[PDB]
């Protein structure tokens, strides 16, 4: 329906909003990222497309932190990703500033989803093009995972994948037993997934970034120590025949 796809405040004869769907499609042409929750924790992983060797480790990262016990794995346009990370940081900061303790994951996810929806309602600002994951952990509630689509979706997923290589990742993740596992083998599973779905004719350099929060770290978000990452890297590399 070309002709009405020029402003957010303009419908289509069929009924769809075309700018929103364009933003939906615009997140596909990026890298890939997955995230799984075990019995007592979560874990993520991103295929960081490393450019020429002029850069180094600690470059533009996609595993930000939002609080002492939450973190994201955003995969899309980086400027909007940083803006959203700052907004979520401010939200959690305000909640802890006056309500005590720390924000539950569901409330923060809902607030961020509503904020990212607020832009697609006006003819003054473009919608955000980016996917968004907000896995975290608790002490009594358990381990929770959420994904936020660019427009309004804020569903809760057991484990999903966002980015270009997404359909194959979903199909391969479908064949797991991620309801009675621990945080010492889901990491290896994630590594083998990210190496079983990775194109090589258009991608040349890879650098896996992993992070988990759970009972092994008693509720704290941080990058995996280099030893475990190297062991998972070796296992995944040797698993491909």
């Amino acid at each position: 329906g070309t002709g009405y796809d020029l402003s957010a405040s303009t419908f289509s004869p069929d009924g769809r909003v075309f700018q929103v769907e364009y933003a939906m499609k615009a997140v596909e042409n990026s890298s890939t990222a997955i995230g799984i929750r075990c019995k007592d924790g979560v874990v993520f992983g991103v295929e960081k497309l490393v450019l020429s060797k002029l850069y180094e480790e600690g470059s533009n990262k996609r595993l930000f932190n939002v609080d002492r016990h939450v973190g994201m794995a955003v995969a899309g346009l980086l400027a909007d990703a940083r803006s959203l990370a700052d907004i979520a940081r401010e939200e959690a900061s305000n909640f802890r500033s006056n309500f005590g303790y720390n924000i539950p994951l569901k409330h923060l996810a809902d607030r961020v989803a509503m904020y990212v929806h607020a832009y697609t309602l006006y003819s003054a600002v473009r919608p955000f093009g980016c996917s968004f994951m907000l896995g975290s952990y608790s002490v009594n509630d358990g381990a929770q995972l959420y994904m936020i689509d660019p427009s309004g979706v804020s569903y809760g997923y057991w484990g999903c994948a966002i980015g270009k290589a997404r359909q194959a990742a979903k199909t391969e993740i479908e064949k797991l037993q991620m309801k009675e596992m621990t945080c010492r083998d889901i990491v290896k599973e994630v590594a083998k997934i990210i190496y079983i779905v990775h194109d090589e004719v258009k991608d040349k350099a890879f650098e896996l970034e992993l992070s988990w929060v759970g009972e092994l770290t008693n509720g704290r978000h941080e990058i995996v120590p280099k030893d475990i990452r190297e062991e998972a890297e070796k296992y995944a590399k040797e698993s491909l025949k």
Binding site: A8, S9, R16, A113, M114, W158, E174
Partner: protein, 244 residues
């Protein structure tokens, strides 16, 4: 806004048609069916049962955070249908309005005032040349101490009404016809009769078998005004008792 209003007879909200019809709001009406759902709310004489439909796209998605039955006040519900990204905002707006009214007048709101406030704040979006009429179907539920249970429906245009039975979704026409046929036969009802009627209407409209865990039910009764959601056990028991 430095982008202007697109020229055309149906490309913006503030331009009238040559015959005098708002085409943008008609597109908004057509937009509800895009998502694809069906919701039926029937009021008897002492109950206000609401039934809806739940669809899981896949297996990984959790089954506890996909509900389309929110709570507005302590004893008012909603069966929001359409695009989720706009119902998720209208629900918050209605909650804020209800809290403000309770603070300013000190008692629980009759359903009519909440419906009117939502309709007005939705209509105000259809005059300024900066807005988009967010597409939803604001169906209310609740009981009143002066007139009994009441069921109200609102539309993106802003035209609200009072219905003794309502169907909203992609199968509105045949469901409304079936409810019209059924209502004219008998007048008295009860909780079990209303629940069975709603389930039968949904099944005969969708023309499919209902799994024990596919439909959620929220009700309010005279004895228990508090808005409660039927658990899996009660829904399964009613479904297996149906047609037996």
């Amino acid at each position: 806004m430095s982008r202007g209003s697109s020229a055309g007879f149906d490309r913006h909200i503030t331009i009238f048609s040559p015959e005098g019809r708002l085409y943008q709001v008609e597109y908004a009406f057509k937009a509800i069916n895009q998502g694809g759902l069906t919701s039926v709310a029937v009021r008897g004489k002492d109950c206000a049962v609401i039934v809806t439909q739940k669809k899981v796209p896949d297996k990984l998605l959790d089954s506890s955070t996909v509900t389309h039955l929110f709570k507005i006040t302590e004893n008012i519900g909603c069966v929001m249908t359409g695009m989720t990204a706009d119902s998720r905002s209208q629900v918050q707006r209605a909650r804020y309005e209800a809290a403000n009214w309770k603070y300013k007048y000190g008692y629980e709101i009759p359903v009519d005032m909440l419906c009117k406030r939502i309709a007005d704040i939705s209509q105000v979006y259809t005059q300024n040349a900066e807005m988009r009429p967010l597409g939803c179907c604001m169906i209310l539920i609740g009981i009143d101490e002066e007139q009994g249970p009441q069921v109200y429906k609102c539309d993106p245009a802003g035209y609200y009404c009072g219905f003794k039975a309502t169907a909203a979704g992609v199968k509105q026409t045949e469901s409304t016809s079936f409810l019209e046929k059924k209502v004219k036969k008998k007048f008295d009802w009860t909780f079990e009769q209303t629940v069975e009627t709603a389930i039968t209407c949904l099944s005969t409209v969708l023309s499919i078998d209902f799994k024990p865990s596919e439909i959620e039910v929220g009700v309010v009764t005279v004895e228990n005004p508090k808005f409660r959601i039927l658990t899996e056990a009660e829904i399964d028991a009613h479904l297996v008792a149906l047609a037996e």
